[PDB]
A paper describes a structure:
The neuraminidase inhibitors (NAIs) oseltamivir and zanamivir are the antiviral agents available in France to treat influenza A or B virus infections. The NA active site includes catalytic residues (R118, D151, R152, R224, E276, R292, R371, and Y406; N2 numbering) that interact directly with the sialic acid substrate and framework residues (E119, R156, W178, S179, D/N198, I222, E227, H274, E277, N294, and E425; N2 numbering) that stabilize the active site. NAs are divided into 3 phylogenic groups: influenza B viruses, group 1 (N1, N4, N5, and N8), and group 2 (N2, N3, N6, N7, and N9) from influenza A viruses.
We used X-ray crystallography to understand the structural basis of resistance to oseltamivir conferred by NA carrying the I221L substitution.
Author numbering:
A (entry chain B), B (entry chain A), C (entry chain B), D (entry chain A): 76 to 465
The structure:
């Protein structure tokens, strides 16, 4: 019988490398015979036996006749879908889990938990599914687009932890954490500290005691809010990342935000979901992050790392590790996840590479994956290979 | 080793919410590369591990060259098909179970039973399949279109109960129930009471002792015949639902049928299969029902509920619970089903949303699913998103 | 662990009924988006858990550009393929087992055995595959198109029995039987009696001791050669069926062949593979057969039955049971098979319904299935629904 | 519970025969509705339960709009993919394992190991994946296109051995072997002897003590370098095959390289990966090889065998065993593999049949399979059946 899973030590390694590209629109030509789904906000979550590649589809394929509206975020057609990682998400390969315009998912060792938010902007609804069964919901508390992570939730000993938020995209958005067990919400956690705006948290285990998240402040700062959640006391605290290497887009020059660690600085309005994943060693913790190559545009994606220290207090620049996507290619959302090897966990970062041709045509994304493997330096970047005119 | 299943107490909850849309014709454009099957009369049935989405296909895809005849009900090509719930029912995803122009299916805890009626109108034949094996048949007893539920049958302790009927759609159609065990009919059950017209029953467990069904009278009344079947004595009785909230379509204004509960009233000719599902609690029983928003057309779908009482005797209006499908969208057949969570059952209602462009084009359907989940009020409605011109 | 299978008593029943149509070319329109494979000689074989639908493909799809040659029988491209019964055999659903222009297959309780003959006409080669592994071959002994059953072989206690033949289609073709165990040929059986021409045997168990086959004489007679094979002594004898109801096509009027049971009569040249399946009861054996409705053309298919007696000696007409395919629809090869229910076997007959438009267009087939189920009379016929111009 | 696998004695047999053709571009017509992937360098590897058909795709389908570049070898889009052997490798059937422009894979009895090399020419990177997890890397040691076998690696007792090489295609390329256990490289093995150029080794077990490989020298000779790797001491030595039957393409006339076994001779520049597989018997060893029918072009494929002796010392011609592909058809890379029967191993040779129409059109391949089976002589050749204009 399957047991609850826990975070384990990470597999040996000191550099990330290019692992896999999932580029469904390489097969979406009018000259072709395929039906890749139109998606955005992909993420990956893994259990003991398989990884699933999730996304939010507009319920439309390329080529097709429903391109109009695919540049939008929320409508009554959007669904959370998945395929086994490594499969191309087409109309036929994919499975439709639930209606959702914001999502998350995770495996607790026994079963998959799926999370989807839908409903009207002023009264949206988070829905929880455990395996095939719809099991619970959570209601909007600020009546301003309740929404969730767009990346994997995190389970330990059967308790799955999930960030949600609600509030104006250009004002206050005070997040909360839900503790969910076998598909049912058993506790709400209200974070303390710097809470004025936190959304799209990318979260993972720093240890058996602590979940950490690197999130997006869409109104006030280009520093990322950083959550430390103690899963033993079920309490969370949030402070801005102090590093000079500001991880949001847009952002000012590195190090140019004057004042104490808590200072907001300029170019704070706007944002992007960012990649973040832990490398747990015997007596060290590696924190790996990604940010766009452009300071203002969703172009390129670079990988950064820092071992140990307090991210709330260290102003040190992160160490640049490598270009995962060049400045000539799209770099949109990024997320962390861990693959389960036989005895250890493999930290990875995925990158959403959006095909953006404006509102007059289809709008979708490829997914690039980089994982910790071996030593040395990160060697190759990723391109989608897609010509949007075909 | 698998054991026989029994109905269990329902999962906690007090409102339904939008769960999932299966809209295969979102991919049926001539500009596209997909092959959704042309279907009608979808329904869902679940076993301990998976849910299956069934329908009757005309053995034709969209886009395709066999649209002519897809608006008809019975022919030599119609088949019962299924996919795993969440998969799009295409030519390649689907499995063809048996020739059938009327259908049902259910899981007894060990194996699937599939039910399909075909043959000439004056001498049709119900066929039973257990897993891969064709195991039994039952003959027409009135020689006027023997037909069955178009929704899940119900199994308890290995015994599966199924409504069948036979007789004029505009006259007498006295139903019977079959008791089926491991694919073989072991008993016929002859209901007493108000028996002159009962078809397309939507059935479920009120408890371990009782199956209840809400059915269609296509001839005499807009009230639904309501079956109570005692599975301990294998006997059944039928009376009209007394509620002022008449569930058939067409129907007169609510409460306008004067006289005692048994009064047939006006606008009784015509009808539609209706959603019905139980919420079994320790000391009370919830009965959830759906009906079109239009009193005369197959447009829209609203949800209603009433706890406890006797549906044969209570004239009280059902409580309106919300709009699942607005009156601007098609609302055709609806059906109940239950998903098996680990320790409890989740009641759901499914809605057939027919794409009707007349007899000169294709004729098929989407399926929308609403399930009991959380508390509060039902929040969002469903659209198919399909433009039939594409 | 799986055990060797043996023939069991047949499930209760006294009539066949229409079960299932597999008509892949309903989705082969140029207006469509599917890829049904171009096939002929379908047959079905079942194991304890699933039935497989086999055919010989020309390695070409409809619509496609390789129609030229699909009316032929033997070339270097033909392969034995299968899908799970109930799936449409398309390019993607199908699995390609081996190069073959004549085939057979069967399950021994533990594993599938696949049989395929290919090679040049004057030195063809039978190949045996057990699961994934190629395990043995048998060589041509008459150097005149070695060929096999085009229907399921038959396994008992791990020993699988298979008819092969070799010789002129318009002269002598003396068949042999191979005994194969775990993919390896362990014995050749040389039949005695009337052996001058036997091919395309349709075989099944009359009991644990005896396999019987109804075969095709393509040169001398419209009576079918009938094999009795004793699997306990591994000996076989062949005599012509004596019944006045001649099962081959073409054929003279029933009963018109004068003289003793062994008389050949007129219209013997030409032939067709015929359906034959056993209904094994406690103290009776039902023999079910099929033949075309037309005496000279591959049009229509009717079902016949006789209980008990010696088919070598009884001149009695078989009892007509029902029209499975009308005289207006194609009726080509037919075959027997048995589905394994939990405790008993279900006898079935499948019918190849060839789409024949001549050599200037594609040439393929649908498969119709009829099985023993319930009592009464056979109620409905099967049509392919295909318009070859689309 | 699974155990480590070891090479076993080969199944009985004395000749190869045509087994199976995988020709996905038979379905790639513009008139069709399929999406075979554009691939090259296919190979097959088998575990205890299934065989997988691997290839390197250009991440493009036929028909499609990305043909430009498919005649090249290395780019940022190439991926290692697989399907179950017998399935057509299409967009939807295939699974994408990892970014790779050179590949290998093998099963150790418990799990699949996948090998993919990508990165820039001057600093390429071998990546190892065990099941779903990326587990290790190995760096370029000569900074000139690190590359691997393009055929199955070989596992014994959980230890998997793999050839890699690095260096100029027209100069020195000294190979090494990696010993890999559960996805992690545990030893590097440095061969001695004739080491100046070895690439694309086709390797297999001669016994539990010895792996042998037949490789390609793209620079110096038409003789194949022949590796003997002792897995008990983890050491290797390489010498040229002495046989007069030179296996490379191009090559001079058989026997025309004068002088001792080590003589390089003429027409050594250029080369092709060659098929090689062992037939292990109680007291003898069969070595089966394939080479093109043309001495200078990649046309045709013939099979050769020799029992016993020392391939380093014996100048004797190999025995010609038959034409697998005629000189009218393409014969490109070939490879060995073994299928696991229940108690013994079946040696096979696979042949890449490239569809080459130049750089102005698509460039892909079919795969033909020949396996040891039965006795006598090899009887039929393979054609792809593909018209590139369609
Ligand atoms: C309808 O009748 C069935 C059969 O009696 C009821 O199912 C039974 O439910 C009880 C309690 O709900 C189960 O007892 C449990 O046994 C497990 C061990 O298997 C134990 O760990 C639990 O603490 C509990 O004692 C019983 O197993 C179960 N039987 C079967 C065959 O499933 C069902 O509850 C009834 N439905 C109603 C009342 O709505
Ligand atoms: C390479 O070495 C391996 C490991 O020693 C050899 O595999 C072993 O082969 C022997 C006989 O072929 C197997 O013995 C058998 O054991 C079973 C019970 O498991 C018994 O029923 C049989 O009668 C027989 O005694 C042994 O199990 C097997 N070991 C493993 C781990 O597979 C292999 O034969 C060698 N390859 C050669 C010599 O080519
Ligand atoms: C978190 O705690 C779990 C629970 O103890 C740890 O999992 C155990 O790890 C040890 C070896 O480190 C194994 O021997 C046990 O079998 C594991 N138990 C379970 C239930 O998996 C886990 O290693 C801890 N995570 C760390 C230390 O990073
Ligand atoms: C759609 O199908 C119907 C019924 O098959 C067709 O109507 C028949 O047309 C034929 C003409 O060949 C007449 O002989 C029959 O009497 C008609 N039957 C009925 C019931 O009207 C109709 O033609 C088809 N439509 C198209 C566009 O082909
Ligand atoms: C043929 O022989 C087999 C072998 O005995 C019979 O299978 C047995 O059937 C009995 C009941 O009839 C069971 O109790 C045994 O468990 C079966 N054994 C196996 C190995 O399956 C089979 O019934 C015989 N076929 C007939 C009588 O038609
Ligand atoms: C096929 O691809 C090649 C390489 O990408 C194309 O060749 C390039 O064409 C551009 C024109 O925009 C030149 O600037 C480059 O110098 C060319 N590169 C090389 C290596 O020649 C070629 O045009 C493509 N073919 C087609 C038909 O589009
Ligand atoms: C979608 O775009 C079209 C223009 O192409 C516009 O007319 C239409 O109103 C848009 N849809 C909605 C829902 O506004
Ligand atoms: C196939 O038919 C064409 C005519 O459409 C003919 O020219 C060709 O020769 C035929 N193929 C063979 C192999 O003869
Ligand atoms: Ca910001
Ligand atoms: Ca009515
Ligand atoms: Ca004849
Ligand atoms: Ca060379």
């Amino acid at each position: 019988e399957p047991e609850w899973t826990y975070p384990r030590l990470s597999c040996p390694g000191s550099t990330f490398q290019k692992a896999l590209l999932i580029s469904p629109h390489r097969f979406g030509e009018t000259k072709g015979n395929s039906a890749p789904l139109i998606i955005r906000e992909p993420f990956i979550a893994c259990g003991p036996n398989e990884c699933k590649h999730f996304a939010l589809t507009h319920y439309a394929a390329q080529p097709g006749g429903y391109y109009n509206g695919t540049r939008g975020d929320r409508n009554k057609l959007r669904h959370l879908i998945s395929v086994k990682l490594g499969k191309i998400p087409t109309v036929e390969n994919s499975i439709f889990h639930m209606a959702a315009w914001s999502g998350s998912a995770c495996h607790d060792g026994k079963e998959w938990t799926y999370i989807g938010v839908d409903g009207p902007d002023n009264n949206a609804l988070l829905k929880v599914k455990y395996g095939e069964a719809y099991t619970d919901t959570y209601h909007s508390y600020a009546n301003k687009i309740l929404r969730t992570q767009e990346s994997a939730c995190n389970c330990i000993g059967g308790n799955c932890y999930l960030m949600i938020t609600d509030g104006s995209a250009s004002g206050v958005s005070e997040c909360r954490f839900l503790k969910i067990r076998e598909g049912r919400i058993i506790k709400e956690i209200f974070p303390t500290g710097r809470v004025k705006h936190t959304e799209e948290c990318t979260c993972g285990f720093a240890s058996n005691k602590t979940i950490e998240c690197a999130c997006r402040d869409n109104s006030y700062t280009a520093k990322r809010p950083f959550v430390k959640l103690n899963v033993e006391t079920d309490t969370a605290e949030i402070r801005l990342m102090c590093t000079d290497t500001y991880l949001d887009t847009p952002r000012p020059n590195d190090g140019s935000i004057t004042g104490p660690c808590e200072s907001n600085g300029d170019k704070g309005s706007g944002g992007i979901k960012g990649g973040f994943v832990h490398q747990r060693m015997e007596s060290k913790i590696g924190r790996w992050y990604s940010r766009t190559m452009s300071k203002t545009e969703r172009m390129g994606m670079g990988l950064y790392v820092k071992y140990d220290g307090d991210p709330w207090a260290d102003s040190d620049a992160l160490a640049f590790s490598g270009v995962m996507v060049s400045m000539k290619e799209p770099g949109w959302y990024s997320f962390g996840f861990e693959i389960k090897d036989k005895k250890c966990d493999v930290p990875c970062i995925g990158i959403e590479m959006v095909h953006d041709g404006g509102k007059e045509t289809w709008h979708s994304a490829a997914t690039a994956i980089y994982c910790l493997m071996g030593s040395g330096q990160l060697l190759w970047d990723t391109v989608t290979g897609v010509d949007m005119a075909l």
